[PDB]
Amino acid sequence: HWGYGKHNGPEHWHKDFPIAKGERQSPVDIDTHTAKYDPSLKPLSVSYDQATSLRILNNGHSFQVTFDDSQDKAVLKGGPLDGTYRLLQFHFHWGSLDGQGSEHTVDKKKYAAELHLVHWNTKYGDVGKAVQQPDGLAVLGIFLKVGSAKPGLQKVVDVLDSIKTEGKSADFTNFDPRGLLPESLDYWTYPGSLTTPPLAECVTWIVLKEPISVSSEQVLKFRKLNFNGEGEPEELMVDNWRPAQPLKNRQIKASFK
Numbered sequence: 001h002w003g004y005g006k007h008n009g010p011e012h013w014h015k016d017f018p019i020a021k022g023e024r025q026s027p028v029d030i031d032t033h034t035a036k037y038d039p040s041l042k043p044l045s046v047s048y049d050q051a052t053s054l055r056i057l058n059n060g061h062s063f064q065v066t067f068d069d070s071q072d073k074a075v076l077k078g079g080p081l082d083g084t085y086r087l088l089q090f091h092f093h094w095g096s097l098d099g100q101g102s103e104h105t106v107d108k109k110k111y112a113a114e115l116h117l118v119h120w121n122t123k124y125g126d127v128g129k130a131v132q133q134p135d136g137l138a139v140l141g142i143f144l145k146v147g148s149a150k151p152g153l154q155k156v157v158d159v160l161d162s163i164k165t166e167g168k169s170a171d172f173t174n175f176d177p178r179g180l181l182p183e184s185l186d187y188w189t190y191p192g193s194l195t196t197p198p199l200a201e202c203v204t205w206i207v208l209k210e211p212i213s214v215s216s217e218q219v220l221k222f223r224k225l226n227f228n229g230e231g232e233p234e235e236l237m238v239d240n241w242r243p244a245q246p247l248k249n250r251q252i253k254a255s256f257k
């Protein structure tokens, strides 16, 4: 039932998922001047050398690239995290136009899109158990601006024609997510939630300061995806972002001065 439209979008989600009005909801506006530099924060450890991508899927809300998370092959550690988080999938949020699409904002600035690399804490054994824990998930968030192409994204863009509508999936092996990362791992971090139903308050957010640049042609291909299933009225998969939620009693910490 839930989606991003007038009648089922973010302003409606609290009816099925009352935690939507909870104390640690995501995304948020990152007020860069209010974020506290924390010299105690460790550099983020991103270990993706042995990542095994499996499939690419249109779930009717985004598309995701799924990984083998049955072993510690692609893990996030350090930064604000205690222990080891396995990469499950990455997906994106994007806009109908370049001036919107990101879920996090930076001083109220919206980017064209936001990449989420979703990881779960191995101490909880499976992602279903991890989403029931306040430190279950770590999501690495990367902003996309429009300019030069990101060569590492092109393999993703080129298969989207094969998963146009909700339910479609394809083999997507040997995709290296290191090709999606910016130079700097400087980050902001805060305790938050999933940004779609069920909006579980299980996420340590790690949002990189440095955006990646993608081309207009790359993001145009995201906008050709469909929310609808094949044979239903065509509704472009655009504006699949939740707006910024109240920060309430939280502190955003910066890894950098």
Ligand SMILES: CC(=O)[C@H]1CC[C@H]2[C@@H]3CC[C@H]4C[C@H](OS(N)(=O)=O)CC[C@]4(C)[C@H]3CC[C@]12C
Binding pocket: 116, 118, 127, 128, 131, 139, 193, 194, 195, 196, 197, 198
């Ligand atoms: C209730 C469940 O079975 C959980 C276990 C794993 C969860 C998924 C983990 C991956 C995240 C990514 C994502 O969240 S985000 N934007 O905060 O990274 C959309 C929700 C979704 C699909 C989650 C939906 C709820 C799932 C399926």
Ligand SMILES: [Zn+2]
Binding pocket: 091, 092, 093, 116, 195
């Ligand atoms: Zn997301």
